Design a protein around this nucleic acid. Structure first.
Lengths: 249, 716, 735, 93
RNA sequence: GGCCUGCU
RNA sequence: AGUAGAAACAAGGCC
């Protein structure tokens, strides 16, 4: 109901009507990236400079109807002045902390299921067992190794169709996945995330990260396993070796 | 033939078919019979779908015209007449909502009663072959298929015909209308067989017009056209042309190697001129501290109250008077500014609660001291052209200045220990691995070594001052603000303590660019008389403000106590980089830990404890008139920390240029000392490159003097 | 006793303590005003290194151009751009012979990419010079403006959605009598043929800031949008070629560079017997970009693309053809001050052609006098050579050809050489039975380099015995030695947001521990200092302290409200549990089991009004410009929390005549959000097609209402309402 | 003897004149200014700073090149070499 | 005096 | 004045 209604409201005004009519689907990306905002050259300097202002961050308009304009002593939490090229409003950082102490609460039980990679890292490290540190010269030789320890033996494009069919089943188009490994992955990640309401985009991004294999060139000495490379900073050094066995093994 | 589609069919269908024509990118002028055939297919699709509605029952309600109501459901909903992306969108949506099977090709319609697809195709040939043809094109299909053909016959599997027969009479009447209208036209010489499935195209990227002429002007000197040059390139083969030109080329074009020996390198020449002055934003070696011995932590507390309490701890105030003038400004303004600061500090002391941040009055004194309303007003060139004085901004090499001995002593005392701990580090996760325990022990050793160091005190001073200045500039852009220089340490006894070096008055700070300058005036207490090294205080105005009595065995000194007052400035980039001075600790201690690890790779054991306690091994860390002096690892730590701190304090382009062009020569000298037969192509050029970076910066000149001393001691 | 750190090198070798010689703890040098002086100096220097060439006047642009190719051979060691066509063609032929099938294959993959590439690939770029407004703007904005102008002028082939079609339209625009542009102050202005040619062939010049390692500032250039597609295709070909060359090091990272350097040094020295001596030259090329003539790149590519479809050759040749006629905008201008009348003025650079020279100093006066003859419509012709490393990969190809030309099969002498080339820098290992052989080999290598327009910087180069050398701030001494002073500037708060900054800092510490041999205790100290700076920057202190800030009240109440305070994030004033073992774990997941369910739910709430995600590309990618290197992107692990807000934008557009761009931004974003709600996959996979917005949106409304009734919330009343509302918007679009 | 021996230098007031001789193919007179490099002055062709002031000549029987210096300036204050010991020329008031 | 902006 | 260094800041524009 609503969606077509703001569609009609947009088409009511002449300029947006023209934009909707003359613009083709292919140009979607271009106009979506059409912005006057330059990409910052020195982000640290301005982050250290903007945070000294009042209302340094930006938030959706809806914040004006969930968080009061001021806190107990009267420190303002949000302003009604919109951003430069968006309908979002500039708000103070307190509106963040306020949201974490009296804002609406939900059931975050499914975030562990979504962010599978990070929670698997935590579980692997929690059950790890350290050993003695041995001091001897390490011959670090540079090798190509896979960093992602949960890659399902799929490439970027190869798993992209799987990700769409898992999250966006209707926009798949011609592709119907042939490999049965992809079939089982789709089934599992479909039944697992059937009602998760985090965001389609973040779900797709994390599925891409988990399933897609990624490789990088690093100086290693021993190890060479996927689980042993994520902790390469902790097990191998310039003149010391720290024996380690992740919780998985 | 196109006249037929001009005449009969309605607009809607003809533009739908024209967009379907554009879909796959073939042109309509070459073969139009496909257009007519598929537009008739689309027409039968409509005429078969429309006029057919359903209500909550099955048994579709058929109405010649949809009456105004909510009961406008369509019996058959069309697939084609849409783009491939949307056709597959509808296919997938129907499959996911109806729980049916996904076909591999494009259907034409969907129906509810039987909950499935219809692929309508009316071909010229008779049905009973085209049907099974498209059937074997589609794999294991449950979608029912139904086709007509011009003779008027119908067929389908399951003997199934999904709706009214009068509609099918409609279809075949439409069909024979088409047929015996072409009869008047006469198209069957090709109508039965006009499409054979042609798909081919050649990509054409032709250079022509102006862009061709440009191609004719981007060739070697003796070529006339891109065609000729490409023909020559294709016909070109290697026939020893590099050798001919190498032989013909003059022999003066050479890269002769000049041997680099011990007697080759000469000392770097330093610029000559007036002595070098002080550039720091605060006093480093001549600072004085007024303290309260409070239990508050670094960030804990309120600045103004702490400053006032510290200043009340000192007795012996005198009416201030000029001792050493600025030599270029109006010292009475500095005097009046100091008295104004004192008066307003008392004014705060009187009232109820000390404000967290105070704003000062904009008197003419600080208007001059902070450089207010001095930027020339911006105008247009068309209005100022006849002014003779109008010229460019002064753009020339900076003034030349010779090195002085004060920077050496300042660095010397910047590496000395102190009676306080100037670093209170944060918390880290409790160490769980033995390597983490080793790291923590190493870190504790280095913290014990460097915390009691003037370099750490300078780091904290700079970080706090720049943080406060940046925050005040970003908050109080318009109005002058008072900020007391505060630094909190911990005594040997363990009691925490605060220290007040002085005050900073920040001025207008409407900083847009990263290079825009915010001006402030800094006042700092000290005991060092400025009458002994005046050239180091060229830009300072120094007053006499009191007398101090520090307990000494020579009765009690009752020394004078002066106020160094100056106008300084910074910028957003400078403030940001000065508030990250704590990475000097990193740089230094990373270097020391690299030393320790490299040495421990030799002996298979951690070597930190004996390095820091036994102090047997020592590194050359300075030269005395007797000779080169070596110090323990802790002294090396402090020296490197001081070097990094001074790099962060006296940073400038001269420093970067000299560092690079002297690292080159240092590598060459190291190669010489390693017996690697080093050689150079133009050493004089490298020397000139190094010597052009030394202009007026005390730090870079001191580094150059150190480099000359290292060369003198090396090469032996 | 006087302390002197440099004397430390008398006991510790120079490379083992080279980190001390990198003053990367202070503010790097920045430029303050115009870059016009540097642009003029660079143009004059590029034109006078090729003075002995031949002059011509382009019949299209009417600008003077200097062709030095096949010019007189140099007779001195000064820089020279007199490259010889036959010599370079022979070098490329030998490169092909030593690597058969390189050019044909690379051309095949490049042809595939060019004929399947899309227009949107041009949006994935940083600032570009929009000619519609004569100023630098984001790549997407400039592309959109150029497409709009083309469509308004009648060039609508780009509607095919293919980059090749966009380039076809671009070339067709060159043959138009009169184009039209829009300006706001809206006014429609007409550009004739020559003016549009110069506007499409021009470059925008700026001054490079944050450049560490030199006393003087330099100038850099940014091209337009008409020429970026050809550049993209040419660089794709060059990258595909260099990926097949082991002597190149430009298309790889740092660790790969080190590995290849070690391999080449071991190969050269190990194969050398006791009789052969080995020497390493640590060479830098003076005026690398100013001496590379685009015509020679045209020759190299036309030799590479031999026996290939003519359209491929044409599309790959268009780029150097435009660079050979490239123009450069002088810059911002010059600012004058009058102290007698106490005023300042800013004259644009376009007046340099006619403005009197009384206001300029001697140096600038002479520079303007020398560059004036080349001024055409406020921009200077820069035909002789490249401006700033636009063809990095082709230059690397030429250098690799030079390196391979001494494989001992072409030297025809006992001496031989090899090494590694990365544009403007190289390491050359030369072996020969005697010092005379080494001298002859280096002399011939230098001479051959001078025949290709490449000069070796004698002042910044030195030769020693193999085993010790330098390459791009990587010091090799019997094995590469860590520096850690190049990455020091990256140890602070990045400046993206709270969660992003935390993750980026911990990940940077981890990486520098893995690669740059950062010590354990040093890493712990870095973690402590980073946490301190992070808390002091975001006003998020431990909460149990009495540090009054603008955010210390809410943080303190959250602290007192929470029961398990160990689960609070550092952003919310909680303890830091990070350590050397936890540097690879996001903060949210490390504290997940310690958080209270109420705070956990409030933190990670999808409905939070702070989190905003635009595209799959910008989810967890942060662009950090590394010190002493080109802009780079990093993947940082982070959980989408309420702290993932995006900061405020500039907001200064409101005072400029270009104020309508914000309204267009808002309307485009509203339409894009509506489309995304209609097409959820719009962000992850960019939609493709040739239909218009409203068609897809209305038709999908039809179908989705239908099916969501066939099972879902919709009702007949609502379904029919949607159907007739779709009809209403249909008839509205009709009129 | 040695291989090269320059002679005839000295102190001269600006505008003054001097004749340098050298006892040693095409030969050239070079000068090295204090702090600066060894630069070509003339050969037997003249450098632009020299122009119509200095005149190089040679006696092929006596194996010697000569440099006649006229209208001398403080920029010619340098050690002059042929190609030795060199000969110091200093122009001053 | 009143109001706008701080990488456009 | 001061910052800074091959050109700039020492607020800008709009009424």
């Amino acid at each position: 109901m609503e969606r077509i209604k703001e569609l009609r409201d947009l088409m009511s005004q002449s300029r947006t009507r023209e934009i909707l009519t003359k613009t083709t689907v292919d140009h979607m990306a271009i106009i979506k990236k059409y912005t006057s905002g330059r990409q910052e050259k020195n982000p640290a300097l301005r982050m250290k400079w903007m945070m000294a202002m009042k209302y340094p961050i930006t938030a959706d308009k809806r914040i004006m109807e969930m968080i009061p304009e001021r806190n107990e002593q009267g420190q303002t939490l949000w302003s009604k002045t919109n951003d430069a090229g968006s309908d979002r409003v500039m708000v103070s950082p307190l509106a963040v902390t306020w949201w974490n102490r009296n804002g609406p609460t939900t059931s975050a039980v499914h975030y562990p299921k979504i962010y599978k990679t990070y929670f698997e890292k935590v579980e692997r490290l929690k059950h790890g067992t350290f050993g003695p540190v041995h001091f001897r010269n390490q011959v670090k030789i540079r090798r190509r190794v896979d960093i992602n320890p949960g890659h399902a033996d799929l490439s970027a494009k190869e798993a992209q169709d799987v990700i769409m069919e898992v999250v966006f089943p209707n926009e798949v188009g011609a592709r119907i996945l042939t490999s049965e490994s992809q079939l089982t992955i789709t089934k599992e990640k479909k039944e697992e995330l059937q009602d998760c309401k985090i965001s389609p985009l973040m779900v797709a991004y994390m599925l891409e990260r988990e399933l897609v294999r990624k490789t990088r060139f690093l100086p290693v000495a021993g190890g060479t396993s996927s689980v042993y490379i994520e902790v390469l900073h902790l097990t191998q050094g310039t003149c010391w070796e720290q024996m380690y066995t992740p919780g998985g093994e | 033939m196109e006249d037929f589609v001009r005449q009969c069919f309605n607009p809607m269908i003809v533009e739908l078919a024209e967009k379907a024509m554009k879909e796959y990118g073939e042109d309509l002028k070459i073969e139009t019979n496909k257009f007519a055939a598929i537009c008739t297919h689309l027409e039968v699709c409509f005429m078969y779908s429309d006029f057919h509605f359903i209500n909550e029952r099955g048994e579709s309600i058929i109405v010649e015209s949809g009456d105004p109501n909510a009961l406008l459901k369509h019996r058959f909903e069309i697939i084609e007449g849409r783009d491939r992306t949307m056709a597959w969108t509808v296919v997938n949506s129907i499959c996911n909502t109806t729980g049916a099977e996904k076909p591999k090709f494009l259907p034409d319609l969907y129906d509810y009663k039987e909950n499935r697809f219809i692929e309508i195709g009316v071909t010229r040939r008779e049905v009973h072959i085209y049907y099974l043809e498209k059937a074997n094109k589609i794999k294991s299909e449950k979608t029912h298929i139904h086709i007509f053909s011009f003779t008027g016959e119908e067929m389908a599997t399951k003997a199934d015909y999904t709706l009214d027969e009068e509609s099918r009479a409609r279809i075949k009447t439409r069909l024979f209308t088409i047929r015996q209208e072409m009869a008047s036209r006469g198209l069957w010489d090709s109508f039965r067989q006009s499409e054979r499935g042609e798909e081919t195209i050649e990509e054409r990227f032709e250079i022509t017009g102006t862009m061709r002429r440009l191609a004719d002007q981007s060739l070697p000197p003796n070529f006339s056209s891109l065609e000729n040059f490409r023909a020559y390139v294709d016909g070109f083969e290697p026939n020893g042309y590099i050798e001919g030109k190498l032989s013909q080329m003059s022999k003066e074009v050479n890269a002769r190697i000049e041997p680099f020996l011990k007697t080759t390198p000469r000392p770097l020449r330093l610029p000559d001129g007036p002595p070098c002055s002080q550039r720091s934003k605060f006093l480093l070696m001549d600072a004085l501290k007024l303290s309260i011995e409070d239990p508050s932590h670094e960030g804990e507390g309120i600045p103004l109250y702490d400053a006032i309490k510290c200043m009340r701890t000192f007795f012996g105030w005198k009416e201030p008077n000029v001792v050493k003038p600025h030599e270029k400004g109006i010292n009475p303004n500095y005097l009046l500014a100091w008295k104004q600061v004192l008066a307003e500090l008392q004014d705060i002391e009187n009232e109820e609660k000390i404000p967290k941040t105070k704003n000062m009055k904009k008197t003419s004194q600080l208007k001059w001291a902070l450089g207010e309303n001095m930027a020339p007003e911006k105008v247009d060139f068309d209005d100022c052209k006849d002014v003779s004085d109008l010229k460019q901004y002064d753009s020339d090499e900076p003034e030349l200045r010779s090195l002085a001995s004060w920077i050496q002593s300042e660095f010397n005392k910047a590496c000395e220990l102190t009676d306080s701990s100037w670093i209170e580090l944060d918390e880290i996760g409790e160490d769980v691995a033995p390597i983490e325990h080793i790291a923590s022990m190493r870190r504790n050793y280095f913290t014990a070594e460097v915390s009691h160091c003037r370099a750490t005190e300078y780091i904290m001073k700079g970080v706090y001052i720049n943080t406060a200045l940046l925050n005040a500039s970003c908050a109080a852009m318009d109005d002058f603000q008072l900020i007391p220089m505060i630094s909190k340490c911990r005594t040997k006894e363990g009691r925490r303590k605060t220290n007040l070096y002085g005050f900073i008055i920040k001025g207008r700070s409407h900083l847009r660019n990263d290079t825009d300058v915010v001006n402030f005036v800094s006042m700092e207490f000290s005991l060092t008389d400025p009458r002994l090294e005046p050239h180091k205080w060229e830009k300072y105005c120094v007053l006499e403000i009191g007398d101090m009595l520090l307990r000494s065995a020579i009765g009690q000194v009752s020394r004078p106590m002066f106020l160094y007052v100056r106008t300084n400035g910074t910028s957003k980039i400078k403030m940001k980089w000065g508030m990250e001075m704590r990475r000097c600790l990193l740089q230094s201690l990373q270097q020391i830990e690299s030393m320790i690890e490299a040495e421990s790779s030799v002996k298979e054991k951690d070597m930190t404890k004996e390095f820091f306690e036994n102090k047997s091994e020592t590194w050359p860390i300075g030269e005395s008139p007797k000779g080169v002096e070596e110090g323990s690892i802790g002294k090396v730590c402090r020296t490197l920390l001081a070097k990094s701190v001074f790099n962060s304090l006296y940073a400038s382009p001269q420093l970067e240029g000299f560092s690079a062009e002297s690292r080159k020569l240092l590598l060459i000298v190291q190669a010489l000392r390693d017996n690697l037969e080093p050689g150079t192509f133009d050493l004089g050029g490298l020397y000139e490159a190094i010597e052009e970076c030394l202009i007026n910066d005390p730090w870079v000149l001191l580094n150059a003097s150190w480099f000359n001393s290292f060369l003198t001691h090396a090469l032996r | 006793m006087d302390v002197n750190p440099t004397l430390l090198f008398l006991k510790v070798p120079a490379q083992n303590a080279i980190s001390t010689t990198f003053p990367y703890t202070g503010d790097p040098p920045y430029s303050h005003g115009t870059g016009t002086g540097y642009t003029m100096d660079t143009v004059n220097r590029t034109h006078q290194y090729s003075e002995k060439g031949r002059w011509t006047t382009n019949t299209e642009t009417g600008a003077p151009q200097l062709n030095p190719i096949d010019g007189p051979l140099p007779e001195d060691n000064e820089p020279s751009g007199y490259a010889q066509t036959d010599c370079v063609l022979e070098a490329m032929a030998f490169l092909e012979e030593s690597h058969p099938g390189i050019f044909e294959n690379s051309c095949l993959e490049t042809m595939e990419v060019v004929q399947q590439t899309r227009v949107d690939k041009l949006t994935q770029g940083r600032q570009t010079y929009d000619w519609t407004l004569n100023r630098n703007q984001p790549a997407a904005t400039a592309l959109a403006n150029t497409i709009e102008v083309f469509r308004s002028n009648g060039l609508t082939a780009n509607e095919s959605g293919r980059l090749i079609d966009f380039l076809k339209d671009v070339m067709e625009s060159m043959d138009k009598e009169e184009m039209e542009i829009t300006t706001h102050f809206k006014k429609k202005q007409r550009l004739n043929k020559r003016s549009y040619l110069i506007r499409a062939l021009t470059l925008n010049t700026m001054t490079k800031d944050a450049e560490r390692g030199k006393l003087k500032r330099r100038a850099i250039a940014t091209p337009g949008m008409q020429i970026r597609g050809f550049v993209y295709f040419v660089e794709t070909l060059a990258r595909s070629i260099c990926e097949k060359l082991e002597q190149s090091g430009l298309p790889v990272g740092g660790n790969e560079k080190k590995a290849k350097l070690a391999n080449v040094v071991r190969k050269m020295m190990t194969n050398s017997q006791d009789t052969e001596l080995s020497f390493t030259i640590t060479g830098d090329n003076t005026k690398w970009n100013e001496n590379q003539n685009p015509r020679m790149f045209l020759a190299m590519i036309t030799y590479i693309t031999r026996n290939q479809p003519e359209w491929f050759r044409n599309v790959l040749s268009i780029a150097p053809i435009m660079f050979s006629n490239k123009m450069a905008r002088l810059g911002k201008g010059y600012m004058f001050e009058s102290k007698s009348m106490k005023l300042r003025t800013q004259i644009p650079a376009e007046m340099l052609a006619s403005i009197d020279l009384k206001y300029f100093n001697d140096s600038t006066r002479k520079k303007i006098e020398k560059i004036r003859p080349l001024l055409i419509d406020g921009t200077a012709s820069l035909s002789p050579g490249m401006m700033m490393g636009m063809f990095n990969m082709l230059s690397t190809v030429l250098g690799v050809s030079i390196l391979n030309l001494g494989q001992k099969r072409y030297t025809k002498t006992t001496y031989w050489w090899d090494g590694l080339q990365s544009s403007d820098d190289f390491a050359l290992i030369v072996n020969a039975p005697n010092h005379e052989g080494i001298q002859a080999g280096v002399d011939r290598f230098y001479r051959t380099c001078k025949l290709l327009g490449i000069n070796m910087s004698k002042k910044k180069s030195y030769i020693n015995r193999t085993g010790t050398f330098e390459f791009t701030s990587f010091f090799y001494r019997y094995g590469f030695v860590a520096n850690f002073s190049m990455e020091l500037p990256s140890f602070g708060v990045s400046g993206i947001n709270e969660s992003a900054d935390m993750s980026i800092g911990v990940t940077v510490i981890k990486n520098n521990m893995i690669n740059n041999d950062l010590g354990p205790a040093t890493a712990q100290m870095a973690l402590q200092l980073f946490i301190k700076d992070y808390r002091y920057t975001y006003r998020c202190h431990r909460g149990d302290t009495q540090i009054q800030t603008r955010r210390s009240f809410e943080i303190k109440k959250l602290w007192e409200q929470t029961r398990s305070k160990a689960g609070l994030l550092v952003s919310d004033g909680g303890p830091n549990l990070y350590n050397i073992r936890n540097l690879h774990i996001p903060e949210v997941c490390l504290k997940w089991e310690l958080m209270d369910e109420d705070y956990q739910g409030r933190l990670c709430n999808p409905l939070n009004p702070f989190v905003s995600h635009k595209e799959i590309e910008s989810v967890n990618n942060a662009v950090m410009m590394p010190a002493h290197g080109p802009a780079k992107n990093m993947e940082y692990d982070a959980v989408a929390t309420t702290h993932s807000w995006i900061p405020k934008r500039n907001r200064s557009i409101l005072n400029t005549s270009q104020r309508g761009i914000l309204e267009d931004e808002q309307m485009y974003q509203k339409c894009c959000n509506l489309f995304e709600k209609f097409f959820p996959s719009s962000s992850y996979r960019r939609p493709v097609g040739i239909s218009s917005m409203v068609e897809a949106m209305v038709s999908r409304a039809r179908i989705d209402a239908r099916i969501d009734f066939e099972s879902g919330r919709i009702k007949k009343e609502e379904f029919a309402e949607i159907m007739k509302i779709c009809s209403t918007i249909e008839e509205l679009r009709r009129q | 003897q040695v291989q090269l021996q320059e002679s005839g230098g000295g102190l001269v007031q600006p505008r003054g004149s001097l004749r340098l001789s050298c006892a040693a193919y095409t030969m050239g007179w070079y000068r090295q200014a204090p702090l600066k490099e060894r630069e070509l002055v003339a050969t037997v062709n003249y450098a632009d700073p020299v122009k119509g002031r200095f005149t190089i000549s040679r006696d092929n029987n006596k194996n010697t090149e000569y440099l006649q210096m006229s209208s001398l300036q403080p920029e010619d204050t340098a050690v002059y070499y042929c190609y030795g010991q060199g000969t110091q020329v200093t122009v001053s008031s």
